[PDB]
Amino acid sequence: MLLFCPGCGNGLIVEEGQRCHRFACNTCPYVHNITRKVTNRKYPKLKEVDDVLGGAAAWENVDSTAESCPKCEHPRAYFMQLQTRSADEPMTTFYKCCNAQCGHRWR
Amino acid sequence: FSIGIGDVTPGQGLLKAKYELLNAGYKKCDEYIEALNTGKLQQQPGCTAEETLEALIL
Ligand SMILES: [Zn+2]
Numbered sequence: 001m002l003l004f005c006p007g008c009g010n011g012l013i014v015e016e017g018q019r020c021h022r023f024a025c026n027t028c029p030y031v032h033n034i035t036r037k038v039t040n041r042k043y044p045k046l047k048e049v050d051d052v053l054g055g056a057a058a059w060e061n062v063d064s065t066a067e068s069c070p071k072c073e074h075p076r077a078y079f080m081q082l083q084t085r086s087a088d089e090p091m092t093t094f095y096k097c098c099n100a101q102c103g104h105r106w107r
Numbered sequence: 108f109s110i111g112i113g114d115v116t117p118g119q120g121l122l123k124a125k126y127e128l129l130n131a132g133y134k135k136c137d138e139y140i141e142a143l144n145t146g147k148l149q150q151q152p153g154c155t156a157e158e159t160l161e162a163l164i165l
């Protein structure tokens with residue numbers, strides 16, 4: 001912790017004297033004998049998170065279901081739509097289809 | 108073959124359905140918003156609560 005000299009207000013440093021450890025100024029004679037226990041606790045943050053991930057419900061919390069893919073026609077699906085390329089005047093879609101775990105991903 | 112404003116004009120059935128769907132959706136979202144603001148929103152695996160709210164709302 002920062003502690004400052006009552007005289008000149010520079011920063012104190014800890015050093016050792018002939019009877020005690022002392023807080024001492026570098027620029028004036030002031031010293032302070034450490035007579036008793038003094039402490040300073042930082043209290044850092046623990047890495048609490050355990051975090052399992054990748055569950056199927058965490059995958060299918062998106063709108064689409066019971067639609068039709070051009071590959072395997074299954075109802076349990078995971079869709080996507082894009083437009084951010086205006087060279088493509090047509091729309092852009094991508095689909096995931098996982099009822100039979102077939103796993104297509106096309107345009 | 109021609110396309111006209113009639114072709115893209117919403118029919119009565121959709122006009123009713125949308126009102127019901129939108130109202131229901133807006134209400135559900137508000138509830139989820141309420142939980143994050145003041146309470147427990149089950150945090151989805153691997154995500155912060157704010158992240159979770161985005162997912163449920165989306
Ligand atoms: Zn000093």
Ligand SMILES: [Zn+2]
Pocket residue numbers: 069071072073096097102103104105
């Ligand atoms: Zn497929």
